[PDB]
Write a protein that binds this DNA or RNA. Structure first.
Lengths: 116, 75, 136, 177, 45, 50
RNA sequence: CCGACUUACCAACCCGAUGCAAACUGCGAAUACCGGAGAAUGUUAUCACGGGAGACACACGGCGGGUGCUAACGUCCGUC
RNA sequence: UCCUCCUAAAGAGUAACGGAGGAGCACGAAGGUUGGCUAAUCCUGGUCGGACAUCAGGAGGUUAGUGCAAUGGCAUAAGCCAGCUUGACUGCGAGCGUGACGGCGCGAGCAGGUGCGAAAGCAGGUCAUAGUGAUCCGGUGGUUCUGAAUGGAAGGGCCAUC
RNA sequence: UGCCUGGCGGCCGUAGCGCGGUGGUCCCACCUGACCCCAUGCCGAACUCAGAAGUGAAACGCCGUAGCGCCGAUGGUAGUGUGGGGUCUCCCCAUGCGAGAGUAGGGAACUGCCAGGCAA
RNA sequence: GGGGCUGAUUCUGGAUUCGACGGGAUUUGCGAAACCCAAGGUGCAUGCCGAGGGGCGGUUGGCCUCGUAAAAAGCCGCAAAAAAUAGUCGC
């Protein structure tokens, strides 16, 4: 397993995000999809959820879950977040290495107007 | 051949549950990590849990492995 | 003779003997002698109690000892003053609570076993009695 | 990609006709070999390891891989973190042609060949063997080399039982004497 | 899988000297002409 | 004890120094650490001193 | 000599059962001590600052123990 | 003298020529950060090699490790490797803990100045608790702060330190 | 709305194991393809990208399963706050507090939100 | 009765009795002990029985032997078992 073993790496960031009580920016990487959510500091309610799974968002590309398709929803989520007036999140690695698509998801979220 | 010992360190709890203390007031002196940090509680160099801000000291147990927590609710 | 093989501490505290037996009733054999008084038994007392009790049947059956000294008890030398260290070990007693079955025998007639432990009762210091195998 | 194309179609239907695999993901696949040359005696001198790696040096892509001691042993005169052995983890695609360099042409190069055992398993069904020397490989010419250096060669397949790993060796003409 | 420490490679074309040819990618060096093949290995008799 | 005390004086214009201990028997070369200088209020290198 | 059979038993690790521990605890009291709320009662019983001291040889009785021989009007600590 | 367990009677504390052990150092890396990872010990198989190397697969579960003794803890690892650094920084410090006192400990946060990461974040030493001596005296560097009629000096003060 | 899945949590062993079944439309995992992004004290095992032909084997999810772990009274029992007593190294009685383990039993969870797919 | 020191030249760590003998394997060649497959040999055999055993009595609880009964092997005590098994010196 590489998934449940990844979780304990994410916990140190996940402990830190609630210990200092900041709104986080979570990721989840699938072979053919990418995911992006914004979750409230209370730790049980998700405010902004914009992923490629939705049928009205996937059809903008041929293959979802690659770098340009990951940036397609990275731009959208902060637009939905800033439409709620959100101006502070910290990017959560969610155990994923900040090199590839989950960096490219974070690049578009930087491009949408949010600061992290 | 024996009798050599040390002077005790006065460890243990300094403030009990429900007590309201100001920021920087030491909650529990301990060697290991018998009480872990919840909210508004930081571990020092020697795991000295201190009150980070105003409020009342609350003792609870949470976590997957049932780790005790000192937390502060700002009252 | 009984003595702890490869024990941990040479010297331990004197301690009190309070409470009742944490060993209830007849488990191993079929007939047992249960101590009634409260006190302690030296390891010298046990073997001479084991010797004379086994003397009655001379080989027959087996005798289940339910106890063990497991306690070094010290004594200062003769004609030395108080303190000056802790006294060294001499002999090993067993802290005995009331209602503790000391020795268990199986493989004898009922009446022969009666004097088999009664002769073992005279060797042992504390007043004690006989019990049968318990039912459930 | 020589024998994998023989594995791709002919062996696959040979497997499901042998053990009735309902799925094409339960037929075992070879995944790696462990070409490990644990010389050992290089504890005192470096070049007993360095040329051993250099005698190992002609199988996989590049330079030869060093290993380290697991802990410190008095009898084998070693301390913790000691460069002692040299190994190979030949997993993936570059390893499939090596079998034809080993299981076909290095087989008739053994001094007084008789056969290899069929009762050597890790419990799960992956075969481990150790060649007594290294000279049977084509890369060694007995000109510049100096040793009869032996090396454990463990093949690890995805066999769910011991007979399947025997069978997955048997599906590629293994010499079961 | 990783870079640069797996015991060296070089493609050669080989041919055993008994009328049986085994010409696969190898790692020997320049080339090598073999002597005995699997088909002439006496395990059959 | 063998870690005899040394001095880490600054390449800056001050005469100030950090003071610490090194094992000059085992690590023969001098120490080079860019600490904070208080007088310059800047980061400058420190070499060993006696 | 082979060399099989047998044996009180010497007899591991695993299973089940049986007891002991101040320096064993997966279990866990009484009371103890701290914080908050409240009411009755008490010549402020609470604490602070200043003037003045004496005292720092304790003793037995009770329980908690160390030690001793669970011997001592013994010794050493807790607490009344 | 200092440190750890017990005696100690579940707050802390608590003695005897009571029971047991450790310290008078080690580390510029065994420090800081980020990234990454998880042991003990078995049996299965395998060239020398067998009981012990190296290698593979499973059991197993931290019985491992944690500079060093015990205790407390630690995988979110405090264990382990890699990468880049010197936060082993200075001026403070609300706040408490603790001893008669001297003294010691913990501390977010503020100013300046740095490293890591992209980022919130972390770092003013080591997982913690021993690894140490008050003052006087004088040594060394920096500072006009003072410097006896004055210009300076000497000598002191201060700050760093021996 | 329901059935599912995925993501993030509350509680965290009635919540966990072992074993008996199921799922690939969707999702998820396996997967294929790897110069280049990037990875490496080694070989696209992990990490990384590009894709999605095959697959539900395995993982995972749910259903079954007490073969175990686990929660577990009631009464009795041990101890003890005081108050007295005894043949006072240990007990009794008055009241007050009340286990540990064991016993009948319970147990293979529940829970909050958000987005997709399928049925209404 | 107690305390200290000394306790194999190392007094703080890396034995290499240079050697037959004792343990382990390695390598070699193949042996019912390092072995099985009835097939290449190959027709009249094996076990239960009965039987007695080199000069003696026995002796594998089984062996050279006995086609239903008087002769034969390894070996036990028997016994061809050895003896200044280094010197040099005495009467």
């Amino acid at each position: 397993d590489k998934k449940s073993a990844r979780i304990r790496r994410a916990t140190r960031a996940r402990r830190k995000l609630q210990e200092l009580g900041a709104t986080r920016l979570v990721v989840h990487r699938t072979p053919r999809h990418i995911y992006a959510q914004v979750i409230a500091p209370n730790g049980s309610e998700v405010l902004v959820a914009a992923s490629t799974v939705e049928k009205a968002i996937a059809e903008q590309l041929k293959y979802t879950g690659n770098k340009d398709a990951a940036a397609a929803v990275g731009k959208a989520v902060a637009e939905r977040a800033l439409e709620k007036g959100i101006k502070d999140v910290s990017f959560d690695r969610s155990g994923f290495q900040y090199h590839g698509r989950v960096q490219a998801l974070a690049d578009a979220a930087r491009e949408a107007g949010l600061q992290f | 051949r024996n009798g050599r010992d040390s002077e005790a360190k006065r460890l243990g709890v300094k403030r009990f549950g429900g007590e309201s203390v100001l920021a920087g007031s030491i909650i529990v002196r301990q060697r290991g990590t018998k009480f872990h940090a919840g909210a508004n509680v930081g571990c020092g160099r020697d795991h000295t849990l201190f009150a980070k801000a105003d409020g009342k000291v609350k003792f609870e147990v949470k976590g997957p492995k049932n780790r005790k927590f000192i937390s502060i609710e700002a009252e | 003779m009984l003595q702890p093989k490869r024990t941990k501490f040479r010297k331990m505290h004197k301690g009190r003997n309070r409470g009742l037996a944490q060993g209830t009733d007849v488990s191993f054999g079929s007939f047992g002698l249960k101590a009634v008084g409260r006190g302690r038994l030296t390891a010298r007392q046990i073997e001479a109690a084991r010797r004379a009790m086994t003397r009655a049947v001379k080989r027959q059956g087996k005798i289940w000892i339910r106890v063990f000294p497991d306690k070094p008890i010290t004594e200062k030398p003769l004609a030395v003053r108080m303190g000056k260290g802790k006294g060294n070990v001499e002999y090993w007693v067993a802290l005995i609570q009331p209602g503790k079955v000391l020795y268990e025998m199986d493989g004898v007639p009922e009446e022969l076993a009666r004097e088999a432990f009664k002769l073992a009762a005279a060797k042992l210091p504390i007043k004690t009695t006989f019990v049968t195998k318990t039912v459930m | 990609a020589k024998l994998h194309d023989y594995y791709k179609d002919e062996v696959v239907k040979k497997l499901m006709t042998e053990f009735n695999y309902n799925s094409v993901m339960q037929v075992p696949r070879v995944e790696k070999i462990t070409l490990n040359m644990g010389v050992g005696e290089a504890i005192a001198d470096k070049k007993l390891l360095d040329n051993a790696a250099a005698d190992l040096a002609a199988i996989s892509g590049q330079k030869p891989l060093i290993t380290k001691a697991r802990k410190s042993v008095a009898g084998f005169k070693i301390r913790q973190g000691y460069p002692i052995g040299c190994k190979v983890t030949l997993r993936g695609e570059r390893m499939w042609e090596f079998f034809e360099r080993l299981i076909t042409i290095a087989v008739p190069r053994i001094r007084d060949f008789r056969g290899l055992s069929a009762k050597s398993f890790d419990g799960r069904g992956n075969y481990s063997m150790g060649v007594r020397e290294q000279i049977i490989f084509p890369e060694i010419d007995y000109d510049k080399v100096d040793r009869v250096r032996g090396l454990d060669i463990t093949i690890t397949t995805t066999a769910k039982s011991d007979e399947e790993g025997r069978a997955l060796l048997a599906a590629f003409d293994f010499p079961f004497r | 899988m990783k870079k640069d420490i797996h015991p060296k490679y070089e493609e050669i074309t080989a041919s055993c000297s008994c009328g049986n040819v085994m010409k696969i990618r190898s790692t020997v060096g320049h080339d090598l002409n073999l002597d005995v093949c699997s088909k002439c290995h006496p395990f059959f008799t | 004890g063998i870690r005899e005390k040394i001095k880490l004086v600054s390449s800056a214009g001050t005469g100030h120094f950090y003071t610490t201990t090194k094992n000059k028997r085992t690590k023969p070369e001098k120490l080079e650490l860019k600490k904070f200088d208080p007088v310059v209020r800047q980061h400058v290198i420190y070499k060993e001193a006696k």
